[PDB]
């Protein structure tokens, strides 16, 4: 098996965790606390986000669907499909260093490409932004991940205040603007850390809203007197408050839709997570990557994890963490603050805290859009870094004038 699917929490590891908890007080921030390497998957958070994007076929179905209601369902299908793409063991992504970046691409079966660009925009508190686009299909995705980790006793939680904005550039609304979907994230809980075994749960409410429809999906939480893990329930409505469908089932098994105009009918299969197959992103080889590009930067750490050598993993991890600490001290001494290389700060009225700095006009030719994307950062094999890359986003935006 892969190390991501192997629980490495034996008697020794459980002692390390229990010991850390001993010094903790309920409500504590877990962001400022170094955690053992045996609960780490071999990915940065920047790459973990791409897991959720491994079903572009559903997204392509949505964009191609003419019926508004069915288009919404296909969007909901695309988004729900990615959550089971995760380690089977209770493990978490690496906490990306400040200014860390990650790029990847997809070779789509319709012989088009999908491009992905991301950057860790903040460390205290941790936060990252990502850009995703399939220009030849007029599909654009912008998002941020904002984890707020807390110790709560027998439970620890990562409250997810991030969100994702999906746009169909060639599908206009009542304003002439591209059809926009806003998708929030459920919270990630870990239970049974004190007494018993550890298990990861998704909880609370996920919202998906379009110009015409809206869906409040609840990720139900398992109780003591039971039962069932991983259950969801929600409704698809228009803004007149009319209910069209009910979603049910399990986000890691099979999810169903029940047509509410047929009150006697039984919920039919909406998404089988065992049926369709995920499409993994492609990445440049290490020999082309930058010093603080995710996979290269963490290479020594992931190598050690891949063979379960934790003394070495913790050591290599510490070196990286300690260097960043040094850099933070130097910034204070020089009287400067960090500025993202690839993402600008939000303007008033926008949906996200960060947005890709490159201006990509809505009704521009897809070929020229791809050209603009490739100028942002090295994505495809053979692409070369430039001096412009390391210039802060806000300076690059000051330019173009
Ligand atoms: C009390 C012990 C509990 C042990 C449990 C063990 C494992 C549970 C595994 C899964 C998570 C489960 C639930 C979450 C519950 C609470 C635990 C949160 C875990 C957590 O705070 O890690 C922390 C990092 O901050 C995240 O990493 C925040 C990221 C949180 C990751 C969870 C999110 C996973 C789901 C991702 C889905 C993505 C959604 C995609 C959105 C849709 C896209 C379309 C700490 O770790 P760490 O040593 O790598 O981080 C270090 C950091 O590397 C170092 O530089 C810092 O030094 P300084 O501070 O001196 O510089 C140091 O303070 C510390 O930050």
From Swiss-Prot:
GO terms for molecular function: lipid binding; phosphatidic acid binding; phosphatidylinositol-3,4-bisphosphate binding; phosphatidylinositol-3,5-bisphosphate binding; phosphatidylinositol-4-phosphate binding; phosphatidylinositol-5-phosphate binding; phosphatidylserine binding; phospholipid transporter activity. Changing residue 148 to A: Does not affect binding to phosphatidylserine. Keywords: Cell membrane, Cytoplasm, Endoplasmic reticulum, Lipid transport, Lipid-binding, Membrane, Phosphoprotein, Transport. GO terms for cellular component: cortical endoplasmic reticulum; cytoplasm; cytosol; endoplasmic reticulum membrane; membrane; plasma membrane. One of its GO terms (biological process) is exocytosis. Changing residue 37 to P: Abolished binding to phosphatidylserine. A 1,2-diacyl-sn-glycero-3-phospho-(1D-myo-inositol 4-phosphate) binds at residues 30-35, 92-95, 123-124, 317, 321, 325. It catalyses: a 1,2-diacyl-sn-glycero-3-phospho-L-serine(in) = a 1,2-diacyl-sn-glycero-3-phospho-L-serine(out). Changing residue 124 to A: Does not affect binding to phosphatidylserine. It comes from the Eukaryota. It is found in: Cytoplasm; Cell membrane; Endoplasmic reticulum membrane. Changing residue 95 to A: Strongly reduced binding to phosphatidylserine. Residues 20-357 are annotated as: OSBP-related domain (ORD). A 1,2-diacyl-sn-glycero-3-phospho-L-serine binds at residues 30-35, 95, 149. Lipid transport protein (LTP) involved in non-vesicular transfer of lipids between membranes. Functions in phosphoinositide-coupled directional transport of various lipids by carrying the lipid molecule in a hydrophobic pocket and transferring it between membranes through the cytosol. Involved in maintenance of intracellular sterol distribution and homeostasis. Catalyzes the lipid countertransport between the endoplasmic reticulum (ER) and the plasma membrane (PM). The OSBP-related domain (ORD) mediates binding of sterols and phospholipids. It displays an incomplete beta-barrel containing a central hydrophobic tunnel that can accommodate a single lipid molecule with a flexible lid covering the tunnel entrance. The ORD can bind two membranes simultaneously. It has at least two membrane-binding surfaces; one near the mouth of the lipid-binding pocket and a distal site that can bind a second membrane. Belongs to the OSBP family. Present with 2550 molecules/cell in log phase SD medium. Interacts with the AAA ATPase VPS4; regulates OSH6 membrane association. VPS4 is required for membrane dissociation of OSH6. This is Oxysterol-binding protein homolog 6. It comes from Saccharomyces cerevisiae (strain ATCC 204508 / S288c) (Baker's yeast). The lineage of its organism: Eukaryota, Fungi, Dikarya, Ascomycota, Saccharomycotina.
